Design a protein around this ligand. Structure first.
Ligand SMILES: CC(C)COc1ccc(CNC(=O)N(Cc2ccc(F)cc2)C2CCN(C)CC2)cc1
Length: 365
């Protein structure tokens, strides 16, 4: 009746508002300009399109009693959209991890000069592959009207489509995301270990310089310190390398008594920069944790719908399907609420998201 129509109607507007907020935050804040936030904005675009088009149609179908009120030729469109955006999201997320798994493994990943157009084309390519995956739904639904209509109700009825799409769209990106998340935490655990080794090497060679009577000892210690400071090529790694090379210039000239005071000043710079480099890896893994959270939430909230759809294929004879069919009618809306959940996490964890969204609240832009 109507006591559940209101419950399923708030989800649409919450999804719309939250994802429009996310789009505005990504497109407005100058601090979010990188590949990950561009992918998140594309994800928010997909969520906003899903909430603007598919969710209200599903709501009106619910209020009409799970009956299709639109022209019969548009049903194949509806499912297509419901596949086009979600398949994007599960592949957008799967993209991000992969990118963040590989774009950080090059030894100069902590550098500036991010490839904006490269990430833009990556997003376009992910959308293109999602379009290619989603094309069969309308292509084979326009020909056969019994593939998108299951005895008067507009939903996927082809068991082959259900199985393959569940494998292709849902399970494969989920497994890829899990494996890449594990490999990402394993890889990032090594970053914080090499940095500590560089810090220890710098401390050892600074101890060596402080107590010295030779001229080439300074050269050896400064060379070892030069190798340690190189690190992930931040660019201000080279400002520390440049200062070390300045002291190395003093040593190679010959004045030992002058190089030691310089290295003392560089020691203060070294401690400051390492506490800045090791802090950068902390954010590098915090973003990974937040993205893992959003992966988990999306997958878990879309799980029951796929579980029941897979159930409805193989055991079509040895499984009761009286109330189980009605379970899908709320599992689909759990999957829809997965769209609205993401901005909540963004406001819960990412500080810039919190500030921007609070700015837009309480009678303000
Ligand atoms: C041969 C295939 C390409 C044929 O084409 C297919 C492509 C995809 C699938 C599997 N995808 C869905 O079951 N849905 C979309 C989805 C997509 C991705 C996600 F991560 C989450 C949800 C459901 C469609 C029905 N509505 C009501 C809920 C969502 C089925 C067939």
């Amino acid at each position: 009746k109507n006591w559940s129509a209101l419950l399923t109607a708030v989800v649409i507007i919450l999804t719309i508002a939250g994802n429009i907020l996310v789009i505005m935050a990504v497109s407005l804040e100058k601090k979010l300009q990188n590949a990950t936030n561009y992918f998140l904005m594309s994800l928010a675009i997909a969520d906003m399109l899903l909430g603007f088009l598919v969710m209200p149609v599903s709501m009106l179908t619910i209020l009409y009693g799970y009956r299709w009120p639109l022209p019969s030729k548009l049903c194949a469109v509806w499912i297509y959209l419901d596949v086009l955006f979600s398949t994007a999201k599960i592949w957008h997320l799967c993209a991000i991890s992969l990118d963040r798994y590989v774009a950080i493994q090059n030894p100069i990943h902590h550098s500036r000069f991010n490839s904006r157009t490269k990430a833009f084309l990556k997003i376009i390519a992910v959308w293109t592959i999602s379009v290619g995956i989603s094309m069969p739904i309308p292509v084979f639904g326009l020909q056969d009207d019994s593939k998108v209509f299951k005895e008067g109700s507009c939903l996927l009825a082809d068991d082959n489509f259900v199985l393959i799409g569940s494998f292709v769209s849902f399970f494969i990106p989920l497994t890829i995301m899990v494996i890449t998340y594990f490999l990402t935490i394993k890889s990032l655990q090594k970053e914080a270990a090499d940095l500590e080794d560089n810090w220890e090497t710098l401390n050892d060679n600074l101890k060596v310089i402080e107590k010295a009577d030779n001229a080439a000892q300074v050269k050896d210690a400064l060379t070892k310190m030069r190798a340690a400071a190189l690190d992930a090529g931040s660019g201000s790694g080279d400002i520390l390398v440049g200062q070390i090379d300045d002291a190395l210039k003093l040593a190679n000239e010959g004045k030992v008594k002058e190089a030691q005071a310089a290295a003392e000043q560089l020691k203060t710079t070294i401690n400051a920069y390492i506490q800045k480099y090791g802090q950068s890896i902390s954010n590098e893994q915090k973003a990974c944790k937040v993205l893992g959270i959003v992966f988990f939430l999306f997958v878990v909230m879309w799980c029951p719908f796929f579980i029941t759809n897979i159930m409805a294929v193989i055991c079509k004879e040895s499984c009761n399907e009286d109330v189980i069919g009605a379970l899908l009618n709320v599992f689909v809306w759990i999957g829809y609420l997965s769209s609205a959940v993401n901005p909540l996490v963004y406001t819960l964890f990412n500080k810039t998201y919190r500030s921007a969204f609070s700015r837009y609240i309480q009678c303000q832009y």
